[model samples]
Target chain A: MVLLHKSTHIFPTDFASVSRAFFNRYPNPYSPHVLSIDTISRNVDQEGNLRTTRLLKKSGKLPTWVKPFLRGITETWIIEVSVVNPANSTMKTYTRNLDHTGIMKVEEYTTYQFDSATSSTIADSRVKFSSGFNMGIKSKVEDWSRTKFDENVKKSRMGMAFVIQKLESASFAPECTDLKTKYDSCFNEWYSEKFLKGKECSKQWYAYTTCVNAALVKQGIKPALDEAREEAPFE
Target chain B: MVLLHKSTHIFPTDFASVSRAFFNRYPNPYSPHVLSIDTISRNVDQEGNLRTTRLLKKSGKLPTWVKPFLRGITETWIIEVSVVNPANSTMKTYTRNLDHTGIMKVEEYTTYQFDSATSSTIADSRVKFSSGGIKSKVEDWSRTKFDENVKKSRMGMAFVIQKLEEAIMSASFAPECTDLKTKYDSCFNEWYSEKFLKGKSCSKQWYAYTTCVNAALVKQGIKPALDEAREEAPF
Candidate 1:
């Protein structure tokens, strides 16, 4: 049998900061089950949109009564796929289980959209579930997944808020402090008012990302650019 | 010394569909250098977001002018990392070479966001390169190819997005995406990234996929006894 779930929310915050929080949502107070977040491959497509895929290893305790199902197999992997569309002021996402599909699979979809005139961010979610031919524990499984999702959403939001706070503060990332401040303030201003008017001149952004690149290299997170080995356009 | 390269483009489409175009971007006609793409592991996070990791095998030819430098070593593996946040209307991605980082490593970062009022997607990219041990004729050739390939990648992605849009409009399952193909792709991708790249694998997905694909190949080639054996064994 198949099951479906739906949810909606309105966020008072701006879309940019809120989305930044999403990546930093893990390692928060609300979720204890998430073991690790390792990003595999990410790229910017021809259309210039970004797509990211990650593997999340989660381990938790099973229900006391059901511990004997598979010798206490309480670990599972979850896959999350998200896309942000500023054009429509919407972000859409889907998540589902990677393993244990034959027994039970839970897939969730969500969308977050911003309204400029109203200054509101609308977030919506839906979850679908399917299970193999098992006589019992179907509703119980669904109930657990639903409750876990809601709780995580609550905590992840708070976690991202923390990330946004760091981006706004002075002396961010140390190596790129001066540039970070200038860029953050500039982007915040543009996103709030003038961006809607289609003001595209971004001299500040150009300077800002240059420093951001330098800072990443300083931190050993990114490699240096070798002119001898690359083309003149990059120079 | 470290060098930085940055550029930004506006995509005519929204972020969601544009991102979808990213996955399908690999196998297009424009990108002959890309040999294959296999999804590693995929899942949604606690925040109701989607994340994915993919492995791309690419092979290319060396420029005629620079062939004598080092005997001709031209292929390398790339690792891509990305994060998408719908709440903030942003997709951030980073890609770098897994092997041959010592010779020349070019790390690229990109962010895609939708501009709400104008309904256009804004893409920002930054490339950082680091190299070692006296490189390329080698330098100018590498630089020119990198610049040209970046452009080709964009065109390839556009073609992919166009295909994705058509697929969605038709709402039809792809004829080529057989059950065996789905099974093989998922399992192989997971194994390549989760197990092989990590230098660890207890064993499972690869085994199943290889056996499954192998059996399908045998069946397609018209075998009778082996098919009977497979049916009896219940693969």
Candidate 2:
């Protein structure tokens, strides 16, 4: 099965514990918290005027001047997950390709529009849809450009790495027919199996994300919270 | 440099635009106006307690009255694009691989707790996470499943003939590999190309299903706008 979208809905109660869990599993130092948005605008000059992006702490109030996580790290983001559906408020049809002809068709599935005004934060936070988004990137050392996405690296060096491999299988050796034979020996796996453990646990993690999103919907999207509430002792 | 995480603020305005762009290029009629969310607790024991999992519509909205997508259509999502960066509240720490002696420390990244709320939503409504949900399975025939997932369908009759060639590469031929390979062929030609294009504008037709996740994050984890003052056209 595929995984469409998932997020975490954490509160003051679980925030620190969650941090403990993260540090224990990943063995990383204190992490900085911030938001990162990727914008690819078509309008740009030769000098490059696309989406100017930066990550900001949504809920402010940090212990050390600027927050500890985002400090020292000019730019670094842990993960970026975005889920958007219900895009056709005025739309009346649903089109899909099911016959394998590679031709898609539009079929009507609903007549009502989705409205969440009177709903609670958690009301909309529950799991809505699920699908698979599993992909793997295999690379060999000495095949890739080290400075990919280097512009933001000054602020985001903590968030990225250089692929030392000269290149990926398909990117470089497109002409090599019958890949079972080529130098598959130099291949390496990049993703973790635990990432796709499609069971209740993952579902729970998704629930946390959905819950917070639901809360945000209730909280309003505009005007970043002036101060993120301090973590409360677990009740 | 790797984009492990970065701080950038993205909102619903961007979300709506991305979805529109994704649809314009792909032209798949079946998509959503706003993100949708639902939660279900799968029972490990079929006959035991049969507890009902509380499903919620956190942020986006899917109609309660609408009929589910085609029951047996076996639809597979056709991904067009995917956007990943350090925007997530979670962090993925990279540790050198001890198992594979020559493996570099840069290739692996793990998810850590994002102090700020993490977000995800769907952009292209045409795609799902990976496979179809219980309500819709007919739309996932196009994806190349991992070796093991393909193995599940090996005995099934409704399998697609075209996918077999791609699935062979992902299967755990050794019976021990847990994380399955993606449709590498498609990944090289379709997925990564778009990733490369994100810096440019090569293919707008691809809508990576992960965008739906943005919908979920915005709706569930963040709480989207359905209120009159806050609610606007999802499209």
Candidate 3:
């Protein structure tokens, strides 16, 4: 369950939206063209074959036989991240993209293997928030209780990440203040002279993900500073 | 495909403003929940693992191996259906959802393999316009196309039902006739005979699916009951 991969968490738009935003983000410094959004939910079955289904069915009842063998795998979701009109600009699309396209183009791999050598010996079994807005924080704390599994997941290995993501602090949350000071300092003293590049702390959302993903998904963190920095000015 | 199951589709509530007039046709049934959307693009290797560094490194050099595997695989979609609650007569929290939930509820399944042998063969591919509106009776002319292809599919062949679905009505671009009696009679004959139990003629977004999903998503259509008999109704 290492940090396998993550999308921008599209609660909506599918492959169609991804390519739409991709092309939108990188306009030809030269001419105009109609780019289409191709959203395909692909799946590679347990037998190792690519599959797409006409049935986007969601239900709790399925015959047992199809359940075990069926992997609702998402296969290659393709879009014409294609430049139809190549005659316009020689500037590659990546360089062509200057403005933040609202889309998070996470088009490369960043691996996170299970490294027992660097893992902390102690495990976190509980969560407590310390935000300034007591009521809002308290409500968030309650939400965290539901998200973090104050009960069952605390003892279970399977679903810890799901709960951690639900509980972590975002930009407006208060407890992030102390955690940054505490974690960055400890990480600097132990690992690198500068635990974080130049920022006061690791990005909040990414930080939340690292902590939660490590605890639940059981993957080590391999933060890519290159792209993270490229997109840092907006976050 | 034999009509395996005709489960309902519920439209989300956010469409109230965008598709209000479309929805106004039906009596308010189920409530909708708003979902946030995000899009992520990724590139994977031959092993189907995402690697995000290629496009972000030293400005321009990209890993060619990452291109074919640039699959948008980690997208999480929230497909919300507005379903009627059985517990209380009121339409409540959609009791049946298609995705994962916090609770460990056992799911049951009934998978339908697409077999063209069961398609309707009649030529009902025409749209009969009403006297003065966008309302029309759309016929499924592509039924023959599906029937023609079913023989090739019986051996466990895989392909999209959409193409087959569209092929069923490909040649049905009917010419307009100002004669009201002729139009009414023609539509009546087709509806009464062909296209019965055929899945649908339109895309997943058409007035047809809205009727099938029982108007769950936005832009759902109101099914108009014909007043043909004194005591019996032919839905």
Candidate 4:
């Protein structure tokens, strides 16, 4: 039997910030079960899009009822592949468990896209569950998995929001703070006044951003930022 | 035609130490070009063997002549997958570049096996190079570079072996667990040489030391680091 779950959420932040937060979403308090995350591969495609593959290890307590069926396996490994296209201001990710597929398999696909009209980022997630068991046990197992998946989804959203909040409040390098402030102000104004109305007006924003970026590079913070960006994906 | 390269060497250490050094071979002075290494996945298979995948980022200066032929890309990403079988005291590793494969693809496969007769680890490495346009020059340059890198890689392995030996002599995950770690290490060394060579176990010492270390990690809010370090001990 095949079971599907779909959900949508909007984050009250720009795509860039949301993307950065997505890449740095782990090690938060909400998902303490997540143990480690490692990047498997990252590359820029011919179209200038960024692709990344990551492996995550997580440990969680299994419900007492399901323990008998799973042979006492509580830790799981997950593989996530994502692609980011700056041109379209969109990111797509596919994640699935690497182990314990015999009992149950879960696959999640998520897309985060910039909504220019709302000046925010929107995420749509779809999860599929499949099992090859006798008819009597299959539905029961799927139902339990779905319920657990829903709860985890809620926690995942909270984790992402926490990361985005932290990213928004984080400060730039000392030398680039003023430039970043200026760039933010300019971008905010231009975004609502001209860009929202389909007019191209980002000169001041680009100028200030370039200065801030150069300052960050000079201060050696660019590499750290690049490393953070590498954890996920971006053009 | 596919350009092939093959070589063999003997490490003046046991298979266990050689395998550990292979996993921790990066960050050595001989291969300063290797910037970072990340473990993507590490797990034991049904056959009771260890499987690990690692990602490495390296930066180096390209030859002036080849720079014009290809884009000005000096940094490269490599993926390495390895399997260790303690049942047979053997390990196999395959590594290849993740980026710039279009210009020149270099794939290397290496195997390390215990030589019971000599009580040393033997390594056999085979590298395959393939390219499209004007193969000979690119292959020639690649061969020269590969030979140089091979030398550095060997030196790096030796450096890692030295570091591992030092760490084994005296090092702990945390200060609180230092005493336990020392006790365990001493027991382990004795057991490995005297008993393991003839077949043995160190479960008692291993469990006590790992328990102490894991608790210390949890106290320091770095439990994931401990979890990632978990692997089957040679019992």
Query: Judged by TM-score, which candidate is best?
Result: 4
Evaluated at residue A185, the lDDT of candidate 4 is: 55
Candidate 1 displacement at residue A148 in angstroms: 51
TM-score of each: 0.36, 0.14, 0.15, 0.37
Please identify model 1 stretches exceeding 4 Å from their true place: A1-235, B61-69, B133-139, B168-235
Arrange candidates by lDDT, descending: 4, 1, 3, 2
Give the alpha carbon lDDT tens digit for every residue of B16-98 in model 2: 22322221221011211111112111121232211211111111111222233211111111101122232232222221211
Over the stretch B41-76, how does candidate 3's per-residue lDDT look in tens digits? 112235322211100000011112223222111111
Residue-by-residue lDDT tens digits, candidate 4, A122-234: 89888888765646655445545555554456556667876877766112334444554554455445444543343422554465456555654664333433543444322
Query: Could you give candidate 1's per-residue lDDT for residues B92-165 as a string of tens digits?
Result: 76666655455566777878888877887888877777655345455665567667767876787787777666
Model 4: clashing residue pairs?
A: none
Local accuracy of candidate 3 as per-residue lDDT tens digits, A70-163: 4233211112112111121111111112111122121221111122344311122222222222342333334332322221221221122222
Cα deviation of B199, candidate 2, in Å: 51
Error of 4 at A167 (Å): 39
What does candidate 4's lDDT look like per residue over B1-235, in tens digits? Answer: 6788988888988887887777667545466445445444555677767777655656544443454323222455676788878769899988877666656677889999999999889999898887645666767787898798689878879988887788612224243454575576567456444554344425676577667755654674323432432332211
Off by over 4 Å in 3: A1-221, A225-227, A230-235, B4-234
Predictions in order: lDDT: 0.53, 0.21, 0.21, 0.64
For residues A90-176, write the lDDT of model 1, one tens digit per residue.
Answer: 566666666656766677777778868878676777767776654465555554554444444444444455455554532224544
Model 3: lDDT of residue B159:
24
